[PDB]
From Swiss-Prot, chains A, B:
TM annotation in the entry: none
Localization per Swiss-Prot or TrEMBL: Cytoplasm
Protein name listed in UniProt: E3 ubiquitin-protein ligase PRT1
Biological role: E3 ubiquitin-protein ligase that mediates ubiquitination and subsequent proteasomal degradation of target proteins. Functions in the N-end rule pathway of protein degradation, where it specifically recognizes and ubiquitinates proteins with a N-terminal bulky aromatic amino acid (Phe). Does not act on aliphatic hydrophobic and basic N-terminal residues (Arg or Leu) containing proteins.
Binding-site residues for Zn(2+) 1, renumbered to this chain: C14, C17, C41, C44
Lineage: Eukaryota, Viridiplantae, Streptophyta, Embryophyta, Tracheophyta
Superkingdom to which the source organism belongs: Eukaryota
Organism encoding this protein: Arabidopsis thaliana
Length: 68, 68
């Protein structure tokens, strides 16, 4: 069972703004293969933003992001 | 950034024993609704034993389960 439901993602936090839990939609990078994952909320997804990661990930603007 | 993410899944709980977070391996149903998730811990997946949540109108014995 998903924790928090479908509008609260207690299993990840935004790498750009640090929000936790991710409220709303969640976007997850499929290119960053580091174990920690790379995730962002919608606001940070929609905003042009250079955050390479919060846990020493290597996320480049060419990386692809999908929603869960 | 995913919390846990290795033997700790803060985005899911077992539908069989209600444990949360699922510590250890996590099995997720691929046939149940993408929205309404169905998850199990290792113990509940491997054990052949009735629990009151072992199958429902939504999650049915033909459903397939994958590892995370
Ligand atoms: Zn990335
Ligand atoms: Zn954000
Ligand atoms: Zn199912
Ligand atoms: Zn269980």
């Amino acid at each position: 069972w998903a924790a928090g439901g479908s509008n609260v993602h207690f299993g990840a936090g935004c790498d750009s703004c640090g929000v936790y839990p991710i409220i709303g939609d969640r976007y997850r990078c499929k290119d960053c293969k580091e174990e920690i994952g790379y995730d962002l909320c919608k606001d940070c997804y929609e905003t042009p933003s250079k955050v390479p990661g919060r846990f020493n990930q290597q996320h480049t603007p060419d990386h692809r992001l999908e929603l869960a």
